[PDB]
Amino acid sequence: TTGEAYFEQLLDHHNPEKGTFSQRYWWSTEYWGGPGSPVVLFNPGEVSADGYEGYLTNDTLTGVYAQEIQGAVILIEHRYWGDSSPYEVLNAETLQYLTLDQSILDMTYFAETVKLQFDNSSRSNAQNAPWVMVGGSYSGALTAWTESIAPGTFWAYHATSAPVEAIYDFWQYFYPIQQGMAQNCSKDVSLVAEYVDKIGKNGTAKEQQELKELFGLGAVEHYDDFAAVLPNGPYLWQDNDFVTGYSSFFQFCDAVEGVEAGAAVTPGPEGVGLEKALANYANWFNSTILPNYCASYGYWTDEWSVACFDSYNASSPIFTDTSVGNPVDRQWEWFLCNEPFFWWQDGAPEGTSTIVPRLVSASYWQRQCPLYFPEVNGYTYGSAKGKNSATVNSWTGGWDMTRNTTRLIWTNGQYDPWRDSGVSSTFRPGGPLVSTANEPVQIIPGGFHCSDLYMEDYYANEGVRKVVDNEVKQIKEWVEEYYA
């Protein structure tokens, strides 16, 4: 059966006298073998957890784990998202306790002390039963970082597509997309991105304004805000999985290549060249992306509004909305600016081919932190205080937290936009992590973001099936060691 409950979480694990707030969780005993059986714990991470029921079922990898080991499944909503926020208003003062250490200790404290409605004894808490922590994306890093920082509560860990390395100028976000996309699209998108840079850096004012109008963006006043719309094509790669078919991304590349779906004649790998690619990219954005783009934020209603592209308007509701249920993931922007993780999604450095404009730069994103988070009662965000990526990585270990691990398995995707923040990054010093029996790591061929989490990928792709089968057997083997 299923239910939902609240756990009384510590606001500040370092200072319990500051009190508690109520943290939402959901649970399922569909596969549970009774008190003493395993518990699979999954934190949906950078989002409200309400639309995540499926993780209780074997339609997802967490359910498959549970069925394999006779485990309960618990879905825990992250502090400061949804119904797990201590405050109704999120600003630089109230977000002071939205940190990685608090988020890690939330998980161990919960597993050690929660009173589960389905087992009123202590027999299902983590001191008495094996808890398996599973996470994808940021919650996969939360999972790995918990093994690094606070081992000894959870029994085993699986991290898929985990950004365990903080990186400031994360231009590598786009590198696996460039590698996975078609040759002609990649070439033509790069031509357009670099043309946008040339016109921004060397073109006249009349050239800049005219290029903006091609995209429908003549009213966008800051050139870097125009340049920042070009990644909307590449970003669609993040929505791919092995069952999305002729997806939004592949539609974008066909548009750039100037062909309708199913066309008999298509360009070869050489693409269509700058002039056509520019015209096609401009019209694709103007006609397919721009309409109702700003209206999707709720703050605006006009179909052709460009207000949401103006990142220099300190009064924009994108920056001033402090509500918990905001549509701009303000909570995540806090982690980026404050921890700081950064992961700014940028054009590549000079001398390295790029599929997004180099004018989309780390400084362009960093400039927005004080617009999201103006100083409040003396409180500011961590990167303004001088904290940087190494502050985080030297604590957690970053992608070198792999040194001496126990019962942690990793999965990554060959073409995951988050791969190069993780242990399988091609830019990790000493190369990507080498798999061992003690610490396995698998890369899904052709894989995207968290492709082993969704079982539709398992049935659709034999490469995914091989990876899922291996990690499920590894988790079962490790869990059995608890009872042996």
Ligand SMILES: *[C@@H]1O[C@H](CO)[C@@H](O[C@@H]2O[C@H](CO)[C@@H](O[C@@H]3O[C@H](CO)[C@@H](O)[C@H](O[C@H]4O[C@H](CO)[C@@H](O)[C@H](O)[C@@H]4O[C@H]4O[C@H](CO)[C@@H](O)[C@H](O)[C@@H]4O[C@H]4O[C@H](CO)[C@@H](O)[C@H](O)[C@@H]4O)[C@@H]3O)[C@H](O)[C@H]2NC(C)=O)[C@H](O)[C@H]1NC(C)=O
């Ligand atoms: C030059 O430019 C042209 C014009 O832009 C380029 O042509 C376009 O190329 C696109 C990319 O190749 C192509 O999109 C593809 O369309 C086919 C359908 O025609 C579709 O199958 C593709 O989608 C599959 O693959 C992606 C990538 O992994 C998956 O995200 C997606 O879910 C699909 O996956 C299924 O098929 C894969 C087989 O390729 C399996 O690996 C995967 O597991 C999954 O399998 C399920 O479905 C299978 C159905 O085949 C089934 O057998 C299996 O049992 C599972 O159920 C992708 O959308 C465009 O259509 C094309 N545009 C045109 C022709 O107008 C061209 O590539 C450029 N060339 C160069 C050299 O640069």
Ligand SMILES: *[C@@H]1O[C@H](CO)[C@@H](O[C@@H]2O[C@H](CO)[C@@H](O)[C@H](O)[C@H]2NC(C)=O)[C@H](O)[C@H]1NC(C)=O
């Ligand atoms: C490109 O975007 C512009 C908006 O900047 C679109 O202009 C609107 O077009 C509709 C007609 O479909 C008019 O009703 C609006 O008054 C226009 N608003 C303007 C010009 O500010 C334009 O249609 C888009 N072009 C394409 C090809 O989609």
Ligand SMILES: *[C@@H]1O[C@H](CO)[C@@H](O)[C@H](O)[C@H]1NC(C)=O
């Ligand atoms: C999901 O559970 C059902 C139980 O009725 C089982 O028949 C099915 O094989 C399971 N699927 C997976 C992928 O484990």
Ligand SMILES: *[C@@H]1O[C@H](CO)[C@@H](O)[C@H](O)[C@H]1NC(C)=O
């Ligand atoms: C800046 O934001 C405020 C609030 O939405 C709005 O009234 C104003 O028109 C915006 N300015 C621009 C140039 O978009």
